[PDB]
Design a binder for this molecule. Structure first.
Ligand SMILES: C[As](C)(=O)[O-]
Ligand SMILES: [Fe+3]
Length: 203
């Protein structure tokens, strides 16, 4: 029940309430259910009412809102298209839990596969992080369609700057092995400080 690491937001958060479980839209990939259980790191008690946002790239490494191929990092990052696939928000229930129906994320040059998340509690940005995957799980996914028709080198977790800098080992989702055989099933327990103001947002 130790404090989960924070990880940089990166440049592609879009602060919009899109409150839905299934975030897939028209995207193609392998279905993945992601369950996040939040607890207060002081007490280990579930946190109720916290808004959890996630965003992630599609199989080819594309973020919605930023679909133009050359995305250049800037001070002022604004979306240039209205698409919002693979983005959503859910509110934690009585047990501190949200579930999202998503896809396994793509990689893009210079990054390992990951899902971004951001948590609002008490009118503050309490926690910003990233979800990483076990190397064995990543391997199995890359041998499947459509990920097997992306031909770029996949960066591994140990090569990834964000994983290394921000202690990504503590943020690896646990995939049920049973479910690598309708939909993959992942659980990640997080311990956060709901009275923290994160300074890891881009803007
Ligand atoms: C108004 As809020 C808890 O989404 O920062
Ligand atoms: Fe990213």
């Amino acid at each position: 029940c130790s404090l989960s690491p924070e990880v940089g937001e990166g440049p592609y958060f879009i602060e919009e309430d899109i409150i839905r479980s299934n975030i897939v839209e028209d995207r193609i990939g392998i279905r993945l259910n992601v369950t996040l259980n939040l607890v207060d790191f002081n007490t280990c008690k579930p946190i109720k009412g916290a808004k959890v946002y996630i965003w992630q790239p599609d199989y080819s490494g594309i973020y919605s809102g930023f679909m133009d191929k050359p995305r250049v990092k800037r001070e002022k990052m604004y979306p240039k298209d209205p698409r919002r696939f693979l983005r959503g928000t859910q509110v934690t229930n009585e047990n501190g839990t949200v579930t999202f129906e998503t896809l396994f994320p793509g990689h893009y040059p210079g990054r390992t596969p990951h899902i971004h998340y951001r948590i609002h509690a008490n009118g503050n940005v309490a926690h910003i992080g990233q979800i990483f995957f076990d190397e064995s799980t990543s391997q199995v996914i890359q041998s499947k369609s459509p990920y097997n028709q992306v031909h770029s080198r996949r960066m591994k977790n140990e090569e990834d700057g964000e994983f290394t800098y921000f202690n990504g080992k503590k943020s690896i989702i646990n995939i049920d092995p049973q479910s690598l055989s309708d939909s993959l099933e992942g659980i990640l327990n997080l311990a956060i400080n709901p009275l923290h103001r994160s300074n890891l947002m881009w803007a």
